[PDB]
């Protein structure tokens, strides 16, 4: 993930499911975006055994928040290997239910 | 050789063998040698105690509130306070001395006497 | 008597002068390291100003 | 069947066998709790489903602990199997160090009353808490993380003031990458910290400490 | 009003035991016998 | 006394030597930092464009 | 830091940290009293009380309630004032001087009215 | 709302738990230190007691500090308390002992005169409206010999000024002294037991022990005894202060 | 006051005030005992304990449970007793002397039985 | 348009009417008062709120400062002033003088 | 006692008491160090450390990790061994000798090996 706390105290392996749980405005999206950005060097390696393709599912977020996340990924060059599946707050309950 | 003991009100300061013990009781200068007779005297207000050991330099001490007790076994010196030669600083020994307060001046004089410059 | 007093004051002078020399050496070491750190910080600050004016120009 | 919803979603994240190409998908579900009540229905279900949990807390965030991960309750059931050997070595002591630090933090003002071992533990814990702090949008490569954790857990931050640790760390990492990148190379290619690399790193750290200056101005050497 | 307040304020009127042995006695020891 | 004075002079000579050495190293590090930051700023400008 | 700037972000984070620590210490102060806190904790508590009072402000829309005209504080003045607070530069002023005022000029005026001076 | 309140109360209780446990361990260490100080003080007290015994044997037992004043009417009570308040019933026990002593003194026909060490007794008597002639504060946890010597000087001077006091007039002294001196303090018998006790320090009485080369005194036994007895009073006051500090911890 | 008279009402209100203050202090007391309270609060807490015990009574219908015959207290005696108790006139009596009794005469007898004197 | 919060705790402890000043408020404010009352009672509610805050905070301050003691004394006097028995109305002028 | 007998109950209760007291002293040991402890406290701490380490065992499933095979201590053997440990008949032996062993025979062999 590139985050010292996670990579040292709660390491994540490939194929694991690591929940990020917390109250609002605690940095959950920050941690996930940092992980996606950290995958940049692995992507540049070019070797599929090292490369990590990223999917970011946004459920129930306002469209401008998704735009901000995409902007952050652009800044770090992460959108070259990242796909965003967006079901913003205005979407029907069907899309919010199906996006994951 | 006789056992000297410099003991303060709070903590015993020193204890061990010695060959001679010089000090200044209110009566006058006194020197104690191993088998001195039992004695109880009061050190002078600005007293100094010099303990001559064997193979080591004389140990000089400035004493405030002194009381000497010689017994057939050991010699004891009681101090309200006491400072060794190493633990004494000339400057404060000077400003402290010549001060108006009687106890302050006496403590300064005792510290000076222990230093040697008197 | 004067020779003895000399010997004494000379020994005292050497004893304090060794310590004074060590203290002065440490002081100049600290001053030089502080100047080096200030140089590094000023270089970083100037670079930050450069990138900030670059941001302003690019935004305009 | 809401539990079934999330469980069938999250069981599709897996590490496939070599017969199926050995590919994998790692899941990072996010859950928003209310008033930090992790015993609510959906937090309970998702916690049950997943392999480990990173609990983020507002109190830690406001304390400057960012990312605000509560390492006391955060767990990873995979654990060391998901770390490289170097990180496994340097991160071995972190758990106990931080737990002892949280035990002792009530005695922060009473370091005189603490024996040498306890005061050393408290200081090391403060250093490590500062060490785990990270700015946003700044992922660290695994080798840089290994070097930083090495600094923290090998007593190389003891001589540094607490409030400086972060800067020191960052600066030192920039120093190595600029002049002693062979350490990072070694760590990355071998995924372990060799004895020679460790000695070179210690020497580099000490020289940098010579060059470093604390915020209060005092030297960090020895 | 303040003058009246101050005048009124001038006028205003604002409204077992130990057993003697339990008391331990400090004493000076005399090696000699009783008198 | 002679030894102490000579040692003090030699210590001050080493003081200079090392002060100039560290100042030179600081200048080199400042130049390196400036170049690195300028390169990063150029990359950022490319990204902005 | 990217948008508001390094100084604004730093001062805001310091204010939040101080207020969080004060919130943590509230219960201890309520039960065991403030004397049982460490020296740095007492200093932080004083700073935090002054900070929470200073975050208060007399608003124009509130003149109908307080009967006091409102005030407007420029952002730079706010940042400088709270930077001074977090450094303890106003610890000598009574906390009541920080209640429902504008900038540092209003703070000086109110401190004068209460018998203090910055 | 009720659950939110309960969770807040739980957080508060946890913080209080942590602080109290830390203070309890710190008090353990402080007890060790205070006991060390008491033991360190012991030898001087014992040996000065022996010297005082010798001088009393070889001197006329007529010192004003040893003679009982006829028809006494004042008592100098020194109540030793603590500066800090988290000590349980320590101050309450000391103050109950002092109050019982005051009742006994009133029965004996003496008006107590109050000297206080520690702020807690100061507050107690301030609420009780009992005037304190003079008080000391700030050294209850780690008293030094200087504090004890100052207290002993004050008490002994008040006792001396009481020799010429008749009825209520100060006499030629110009100061209305006291005819008796008492110390109320907590004896530290052991870790579990710490008992408030009142002991009279002046006028010291004499009890003779039957029997065991005699001693030589410079200049003479009388002057040595006169100069030593106040030192003994200071030593007893210091021992009581150290005992009070240990019992407070 | 209009119905039960000024004295009855005043005594009742004073009793309620003391008990309410005791209830408020319960939070501190549960943790720290009464030794951390101010002198006024300590006095009030002792008074409140005595008041709350004295509000109890040996009931006529309670004899079947305890064998103790019940008591009836006239209203005037009740008002006088609680007036005295709020004034602090029984602060010296032990708490148990107030427990499950009738009027002031029963209080005197029980206090005597416990060694205390009214 | 605001509320008067009556609390049994305040009532029992002698504060009658048992209005909890901290939470009671009027949304009309000075417009609902005559000029004299508005003049002599502009900050009364805030002053008593701050007084209650300080009183709670300073419940164990062994050594308060002069300003804190002044605030506590003034607040205690104001609290006593606001006490009022049942069926004892005051004309607005009398209330103005009392609050003065 | 009605199920496992009085001897087993007594030995288990004594072990629990010793371990609980040691746990109580753990905080003192951590904060102020073992020096502040009383002599009886130090003796109990040593005995409790040895007991808590003799509760460890070389398990059958642990062979694949540490090549040593596992042990099966009879119930009576465990009861008597822990009775002796509580009484204070092994406090002289080093602590390391109590790691991952079976009954008293293994304890003796590991003590000899040290
Ligand atoms: N490591 C960090 N250092 C500093 N600020 C951070 C860090 N991580 C997050 N933040 C800031 O904290 C705030 C919350 O971050 P973020 O929105 O990612 O959290 P969240 O829990 O997902 O929030 P939300 O409930 O709004 O979705 C943002 O201002 C983010 O910039
Ligand atoms: Mg988010």
């Amino acid at each position: 993930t590139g985050i010292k706390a996670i990579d040292a105290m709660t390491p994540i392996g490939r194929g694991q499911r690591q929940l990020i749980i917390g109250d609002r405005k605690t940095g959950k999206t920050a941690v996930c975006v940092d992980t996606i950005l950290n995958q940049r060097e692995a992507w540049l390696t070019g070797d599929p055994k090292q490369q990590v393709r990223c999917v970011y599912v946004a459920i129930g977020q306002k469209g401008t928040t998704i735009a901000s996340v995409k902007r952050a990924l652009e800044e770090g060059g992460a959108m070259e290997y990242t796909t965003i599946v967006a079901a913003p707050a205005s979407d029907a309950a069907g899309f919010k239910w199906l996006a994951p | 050789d006789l056992n000297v003991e410099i003991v303060a009100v709070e903590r015993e300061l020193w204890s061990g063998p010695a060959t001679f013990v010089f000090t200044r009781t209110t009566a006058g200068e006194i020197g104690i040698l191993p088998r001195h007779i039992p004695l109880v005297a009061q050190l002078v207000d600005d007293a100094m105690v010099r303990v001559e050991r064997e193979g080591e330099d004389d140990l000089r001490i400035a004493v405030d509130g002194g009381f000497l007790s010689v017994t057939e076994e050991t010699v004891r010196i009681l101090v309200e306070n006491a400072q060794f030669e190493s633990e004494i600083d000339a400057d404060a020994a000077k400003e402290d001395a010549a001060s108006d307060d009687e106890r302050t001046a006496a403590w300064g004089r005792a510290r000076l006497r222990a230093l040697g410059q008197i | 008597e004067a020779m003895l007093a000399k010997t004494a004051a000379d020994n005292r002078k050497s004893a304090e002068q060794v310590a004074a020399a060590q203290a002065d050496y440490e002081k100049e070491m600290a001053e030089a390291r502080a100047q080096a750190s200030a140089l590094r910080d000023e270089a970083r600050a100037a670079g930050r100003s450069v990138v900030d004016e670059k941001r302003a120009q690019a935004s305009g | 069947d809401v539990f079934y919803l999330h469980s069938r979603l999250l069981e599709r994240c897996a590490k496939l066998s070599d017969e199926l190409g050995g590919g994998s998908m790692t899941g990072l579900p996010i859950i928003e709790t209310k008033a930090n009540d992790i015993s609510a229905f959906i937090p309970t279900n998702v916690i049950s489903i997943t392999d480990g949990q990173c609990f983020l807390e507002s109190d830690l965030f406001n304390q400057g602990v960012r990312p605000a991960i509560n390492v006391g309750v955060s767990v990873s059931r995979v654990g060391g199997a998901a770390q490289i050997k170097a990180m496994k070595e340097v991160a071995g002591s972190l758990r106990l160090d931080l737990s002892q630090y949280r035990e002792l933090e009530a005695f922060a003002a009473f370091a005189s009353d603490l024996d040498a071992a306890s005061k050393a533990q408290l200081d090391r814990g403060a250093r490590l808490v500062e060490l785990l702090k990270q700015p946003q949008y700044s992922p660290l490569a695994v080798e840089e993380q290994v070097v930083a954790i090495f600094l923290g857990t090998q007593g190389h931050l003891d001589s540094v003031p607490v409030e400086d640790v972060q800067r020191f760390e960052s600066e030192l990492l920039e120093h190595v990458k600029a002049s002693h990148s062979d350490i990072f190379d070694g760590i990355r290619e071998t995924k372990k910290l060799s004895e020679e690399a460790e000695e070179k790193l210690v020497s580099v750290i000490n020289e940098f400490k010579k060059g470093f200056q604390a915020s209060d101005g005092s030297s960090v050497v020895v | 009003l303040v003058s009246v307040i101050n005048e009124f304020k001038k006028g205003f009127q604002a409204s077992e035991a130990l057993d003697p042995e339990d008391l331990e006695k400090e004493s000076v020891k005399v090696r000699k016998p009783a008198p | 006394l002679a030894d102490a004075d000579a040692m003090h002079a030699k210590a001050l000579a080493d003081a200079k030597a090392e002060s100039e050495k560290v100042t030179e190293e600081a200048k080199q590090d400042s130049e390196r930092i400036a170049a690195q930051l300028s390169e990063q700023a150029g990359s950022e400008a490319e990204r902005i464009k | 830091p990217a948008i508001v700037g390094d100084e604004h972000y730093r001062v805001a984070q310091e204010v939040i940290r101080i207020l969080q620590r004060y919130k943590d210490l509230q219960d201890i102060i309520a039960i065991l009293g403030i004397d049982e806190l460490s020296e740095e904790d007492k200093q932080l508590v004083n700073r935090a009380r002054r900070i929470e009072r200073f975050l208060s402000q007399n608003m124009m829309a509130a003149e109908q309630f307080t009967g006091q005209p409102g005030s407007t504080v420029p952002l730079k003045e706010t940042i400088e004032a709270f930077d001074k607070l977090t450094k303890g530069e106003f610890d000598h002023l009574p906390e009541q001087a920080f209640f429902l005022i504008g900038g540092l000029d209003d703070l000086a005026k109110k401190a004068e009215s209460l018998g203090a001076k910055l | 709302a009720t659950l939110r309140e309960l969770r807040g109360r739980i957080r508060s209780a946890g913080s209080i738990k942590k602080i109290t446990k830390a203070q309890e361990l710190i008090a353990t260490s402080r007890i060790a230190k205070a006991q060390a100080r008491v033991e360190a003080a012991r030898p001087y007290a014992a040996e000065i007691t022996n010297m005082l015994t010798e001088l009393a044997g070889a001197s006329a037992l007529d010192h004003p500090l040893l003679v009982e004043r006829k028809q006494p009417k004042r008592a100098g009570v020194l109540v030793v308390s603590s500066d800090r308040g988290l000590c349980g019933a320590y101050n309450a026990n000391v103050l109950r002992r002092a109050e019982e002593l005051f009742s006994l003194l009133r029965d004996e026909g003496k008006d107590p005169v109050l000297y206080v060490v520690g702020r807690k007794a100061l507050g107690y008597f301030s609420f009780r409206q009992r005037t304190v002639v003079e008080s000391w504060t700030g050294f209850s946890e780690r008293p030094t010999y200087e504090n004890a010597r100052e207290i002993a000087d004050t008490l002994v001077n008040a006792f001396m000024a009481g020799a010429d006091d008749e009825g209520d007039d100060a006499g030629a002294d110009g100061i209305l002294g006291v005819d008796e001196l008492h110390i109320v303090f907590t004896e530290f018998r052991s870790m579990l037991s710490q008992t408030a006790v009142a002991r009279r320090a002046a006028p010291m009485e004499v009890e003779y022990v039957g029997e065991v080369t005699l001693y030589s005194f410079e200049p003479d036994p009388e002057t040595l005894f006169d100069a030593l007895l106040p030192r003994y009073i200071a030593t007893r006051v210091y021992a009581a202060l150290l005992e009070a500090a240990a019992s407070e911890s």
Side-chain angles (χ1 to χ4, degrees), chain A, chain B, chain C, chain D, chain E, chain F, chain G, chain H:
Chain A
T1 66
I3 297 169
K4 300 189 283 291
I6 293 159
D7 284 350
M9 314 283 318
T10 58
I12 302 167
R14 306 198 172 195
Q16 183 175 338
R17 290 82 46 74
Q18 188 74 13
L19 172 62
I20 311 301
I21 176 156
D23 274 29
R24 62 171 299 267
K25 294 296 196 251
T26 47
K28 319 189 278 296
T29 301
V31 160
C32 292
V33 167
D34 278 23
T35 305
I36 291 167
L37 291 164
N38 193 51
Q39 304 327 306
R40 167 69 161 171
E41 298 298 89
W43 181 255
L44 285 174
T45 286
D47 164 60
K49 310 310 295 153
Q50 296 176 63
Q51 293 188 314
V52 177
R53 301 156 139 79
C54 294
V55 183
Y56 180 83
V57 190
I59 307 98
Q61 307 176 15
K62 69 164 168 44
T64 45
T65 298
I66 297 153
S68 279
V69 162
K70 197 199 169 185
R71 177 66 52 70
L73 295 178
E74 293 293 328
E75 294 294 328
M79 285 314 282
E80 179 165 357
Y81 55 86
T82 305
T83 301
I84 300 175
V85 179
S90 60
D91 272 13
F95 284 169
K96 292 184 218 168
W97 158 57
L98 292 175
Chain B
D1 53 6
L2 73 165
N3 317 118
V4 184
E5 282 81 14
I6 297 89
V7 171
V9 193
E10 316 189 306
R11 52 182 304 268
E12 163 182 347
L13 268 159
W14 193 91
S15 170
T19 43
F20 181 75
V21 188
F22 166 93
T23 181
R24 200 171 202 292
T25 72
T26 56
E29 288 197 358
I30 191 170
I32 297 90
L33 273 164
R35 261 190 297 125
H36 198 108
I37 54 156
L39 187 151
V40 163
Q42 175 182 10
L43 268 56
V44 68
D45 292 282
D46 66 353
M48 170 269 265
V49 177
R50 167 164 59 71
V51 185
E52 318 204 343
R53 312 163 272 192
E54 81 302 348
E56 304 87 39
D57 188 289
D58 291 331
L59 172 55
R60 308 159 49 75
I61 317 172
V63 164
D64 207 351
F67 268 102
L68 167 59
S69 173
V70 186
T71 308
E72 183 52 29
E73 292 88 358
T74 76
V75 162
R76 268 189 271 273
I77 295 92
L78 319 184
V79 306
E80 275 193 27
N81 217 327
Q83 215 159 355
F84 282 14
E85 191 185 11
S86 49
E87 315 174 355
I88 205 75
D89 59 86
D91 54 356
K94 267 81 187 154
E95 292 83 4
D96 198 293
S99 197
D100 162 20
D101 167 23
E102 297 290 306
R103 194 76 93 77
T104 301
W107 188 220
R109 281 188 295 272
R111 301 148 67 90
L112 289 147
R113 204 169 294 168
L115 268 164
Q117 312 103 36
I118 307 182
Chain C
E1 294 293 328
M3 162 270 267
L4 188 138
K6 186 180 289 293
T7 299
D10 186 347
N11 283 0
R12 188 270 299 164
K13 180 68 174 66
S14 84
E16 62 86 20
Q17 195 212 7
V18 61
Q22 272 298 128
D24 193 342
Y25 169 88
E26 294 294 328
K27 183 259 167 199
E28 52 78 12
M29 294 299 291
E31 175 48 36
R33 292 209 171 81
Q35 291 301 342
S37 77
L39 276 161
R40 290 203 195 92
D41 294 344
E42 289 312 321
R44 275 196 208 84
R48 207 153 285 102
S49 174
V50 160
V51 76
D52 189 358
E53 62 77 31
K54 209 181 274 287
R55 292 320 82 178
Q57 160 275 337
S59 56
Chain D
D1 56 337
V2 68
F3 175 94
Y4 178 44
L5 183 83
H6 283 160
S7 87
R8 98 170 163 278
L9 169 67
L10 289 167
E11 283 302 340
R12 285 153 190 171
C13 297
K15 167 62 177 178
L16 293 173
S17 60
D18 282 310
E19 290 77 323
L20 299 189
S24 75
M25 176 153 66
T26 308
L28 279 188
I30 290 164
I31 292 284
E32 183 178 1
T33 58
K34 301 167 155 201
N36 204 18
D37 182 15
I38 58 154
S39 85
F41 192 38
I42 300 296
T44 299
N45 292 342
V46 179
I47 288 166
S48 171
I49 289 155
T50 46
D51 309 304
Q53 296 87 42
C54 293
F55 295 91
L56 279 58
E57 280 167 24
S58 292
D59 304 75
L60 292 177
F61 195 98
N62 291 338
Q63 285 165 29
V65 176
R66 284 158 198 169
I69 294 149
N70 182 356
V71 304
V73 295
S74 295
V75 60
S76 162
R77 291 165 99 74
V78 174
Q83 295 178 314
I84 57 152
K85 185 61 174 78
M87 179 87 54
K88 209 178 299 197
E89 295 165 323
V90 303
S93 70
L94 268 177
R95 186 97 46 211
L96 193 60
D97 273 332
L98 294 161
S99 56
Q100 294 190 103
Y101 174 57
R102 298 312 186 183
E103 277 179 2
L104 291 173
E105 68 182 351
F107 305 83
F110 292 163
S112 69
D113 291 331
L114 304 174
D115 62 324
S118 285
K119 183 178 184 293
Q121 272 174 12
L122 191 76
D123 291 331
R124 180 65 66 75
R127 300 302 194 292
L128 295 167
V129 162
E130 293 293 319
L131 179 79
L132 294 187
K133 293 181 177 177
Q134 216 164 320
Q136 202 188 357
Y137 297 128
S138 316
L140 287 181
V142 66
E143 49 266 7
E144 300 180 308
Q145 294 186 74
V146 162
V147 162
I149 303 287
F150 173 97
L151 273 165
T153 64
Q154 299 304 331
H156 289 106
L157 291 177
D158 297 332
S159 72
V160 185
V162 173
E163 56 260 47
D164 272 320
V165 160
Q166 277 195 94
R167 177 162 63 81
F168 178 85
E169 182 210 315
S170 85
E171 294 190 10
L172 188 153
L173 290 183
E174 176 47 53
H175 174 58
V176 173
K177 187 269 183 182
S179 314
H180 305 269
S181 53
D182 56 296
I183 308 181
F184 291 155
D185 300 347
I187 292 170
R188 187 189 321 112
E189 293 179 353
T190 65
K191 295 157 189 55
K192 51 181 67 165
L193 187 51
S194 80
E195 283 76 355
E196 293 82 3
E198 180 179 339
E199 300 158 48
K200 175 155 196 256
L201 177 59
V202 170
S203 89
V204 166
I205 291 155
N206 282 310
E207 294 277 277
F208 180 85
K209 265 181 179 174
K210 203 180 290 188
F212 190 75
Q213 79 304 355
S215 277
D216 59 355
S218 78
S219 171
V220 301
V221 175
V222 171
Chain E
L1 179 61
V2 298
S3 83
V4 171
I5 285 156
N6 291 126
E7 302 305 325
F8 173 89
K9 282 163 86 90
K10 293 187 286 185
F12 178 72
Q13 293 82 17
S15 175
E16 293 279 289
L18 281 76
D19 312 319
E21 62 272 55
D22 268 340
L23 188 153
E24 70 191 1
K25 312 296 287 186
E26 294 293 328
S27 66
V28 68
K29 301 294 186 291
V30 171
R31 316 195 53 67
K32 323 204 270 197
Chain F
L1 185 68
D3 174 12
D5 276 318
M7 183 278 288
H8 164 74
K10 179 258 282 177
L12 293 191
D14 313 313
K16 271 81 73 175
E18 196 284 334
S19 310
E20 281 96 9
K21 208 184 72 146
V22 67
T23 303
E24 181 277 344
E25 208 293 327
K27 292 306 309 196
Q28 300 331 286
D29 199 77
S30 160
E31 293 302 330
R32 195 271 305 182
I33 289 288
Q36 186 59 44
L37 189 153
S38 182
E39 170 158 19
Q40 193 277 335
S43 171
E44 206 202 3
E46 301 294 312
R47 197 180 286 288
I48 287 291
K49 294 179 182 65
Chain G
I3 296 89
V4 288
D6 285 342
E7 261 302 289
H8 187 167
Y9 182 77
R10 192 188 59 70
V11 174
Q13 294 329 288
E14 181 58 9
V15 162
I16 283 148
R17 187 193 63 71
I18 284 157
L19 291 179
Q20 180 68 39
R21 182 53 166 160
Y22 179 52
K23 184 178 184 293
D24 296 325
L25 295 171
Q26 287 257 30
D27 63 358
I28 291 157
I29 295 152
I31 297 294
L32 307 175
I34 199 172
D35 297 308
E36 287 328 301
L37 299 180
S38 69
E39 199 65 22
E40 294 310 88
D41 278 335
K42 298 190 217 166
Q43 185 172 59
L44 181 140
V45 160
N46 297 328
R47 223 162 279 177
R49 290 179 69 72
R50 281 156 179 68
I51 278 159
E52 78 174 359
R53 273 92 171 96
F54 194 55
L55 288 163
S56 188
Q57 190 175 346
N58 55 335
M59 310 152 65
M60 283 73 74
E63 168 160 16
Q64 67 207 311
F65 309 117
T66 54
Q68 190 198 346
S71 74
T72 185
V73 188
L75 165 61
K76 274 263 163 163
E77 172 153 18
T78 289
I79 284 156
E80 182 184 337
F82 277 97
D83 185 52
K84 286 172 156 85
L85 280 171
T86 55
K87 291 157 170 198
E89 300 202 27
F90 295 127
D91 277 336
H92 59 276
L93 307 175
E95 73 197 42
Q96 297 88 359
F98 300 82
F99 191 65
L100 278 184
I101 52 155
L104 294 173
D105 270 318
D106 286 11
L107 176 56
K109 272 197 299 288
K110 198 163 183 181
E112 272 143 32
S113 293
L114 299 185
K117 183 78 135 179
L118 61 87
Chain H
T2 288
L3 182 65
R4 178 198 326 142
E5 209 287 319
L6 279 164
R7 301 281 182 209
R9 289 197 62 209
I10 290 157
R11 190 187 328 99
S12 167
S15 301
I16 295 145
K17 199 182 145 303
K18 293 182 183 293
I19 301 310
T20 60
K21 186 56 160 151
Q23 295 282 21
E24 190 276 331
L25 293 152
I26 300 284
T28 312
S29 75
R30 296 264 193 278
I31 296 157
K33 284 162 188 313
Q35 265 171 323
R37 278 211 97 194
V38 161
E39 300 306 327
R42 280 197 202 284
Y44 174 104
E47 61 85 20
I48 193 153
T49 310
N50 304 344
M51 293 177 70
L52 182 75
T53 288
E54 293 296 348
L55 284 173
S59 87
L61 277 296
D62 72 295
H63 202 275
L65 206 50
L66 300 188
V67 70
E68 190 277 331
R69 271 64 171 289
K70 182 174 72 68
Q71 62 85 30
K73 65 178 72 66
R74 267 169 302 280
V77 182
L78 177 78
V79 183
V80 186
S81 68
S82 60
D83 310 322
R84 267 177 71 193
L86 277 296
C87 54
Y90 166 90
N91 303 117
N93 288 313
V94 168
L95 298 160
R96 283 195 301 275
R97 184 64 56 197
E99 290 282 37
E100 301 161 43
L101 174 60
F102 298 148
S103 300
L104 167 64
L105 289 169
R106 179 169 47 280
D107 295 347
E108 280 171 341
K110 330 197 190 91
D111 202 342
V113 176
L114 200 52
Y115 295 84
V116 174
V117 188
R119 312 202 270 270
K120 292 307 201 197
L122 266 184
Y124 172 88
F125 293 119
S126 182
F127 179 71
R128 290 294 197 292
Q129 317 308 327
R130 199 188 275 269
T131 189
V132 172
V133 166
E134 192 279 333
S135 59
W136 304 265
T137 55
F139 53 80
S140 291
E141 282 197 356
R142 188 178 181 278
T144 70
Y145 176 66
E146 309 294 329
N147 317 123
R149 190 223 292 145
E150 165 179 339
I151 290 148
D153 268 331
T154 293
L155 293 181
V156 168
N157 282 13
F159 190 70
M160 294 298 102
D164 308 327
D165 301 357
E166 316 302 311
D168 268 333
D169 186 74
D173 295 328
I175 299 91
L176 185 58
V178 295
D179 310 333
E180 207 173 7
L181 279 169
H182 303 264
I183 320 294
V184 191
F185 72 100
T186 311
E187 269 188 359
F188 177 77
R189 320 307 191 76
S190 46
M191 290 279 309
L192 73 165
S193 62
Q194 292 105 32
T195 292
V197 300
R199 77 174 51 165
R200 185 192 64 171
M204 296 163 78
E205 63 190 15
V206 190
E207 72 289 32
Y208 297 91
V209 285
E211 292 304 335
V212 59
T213 179
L214 74 164
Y215 268 55
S216 70
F217 307 97
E218 298 213 293
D220 58 285
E222 303 287 323
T223 52
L224 275 161
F225 196 63
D226 292 27
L228 195 76
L229 188 63
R231 292 271 287 272
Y232 189 78
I233 302 303
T235 313
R236 301 307 297 169
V237 169
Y238 179 64
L241 286 192
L242 287 177
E243 203 81 29
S247 44
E248 191 211 336
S249 279

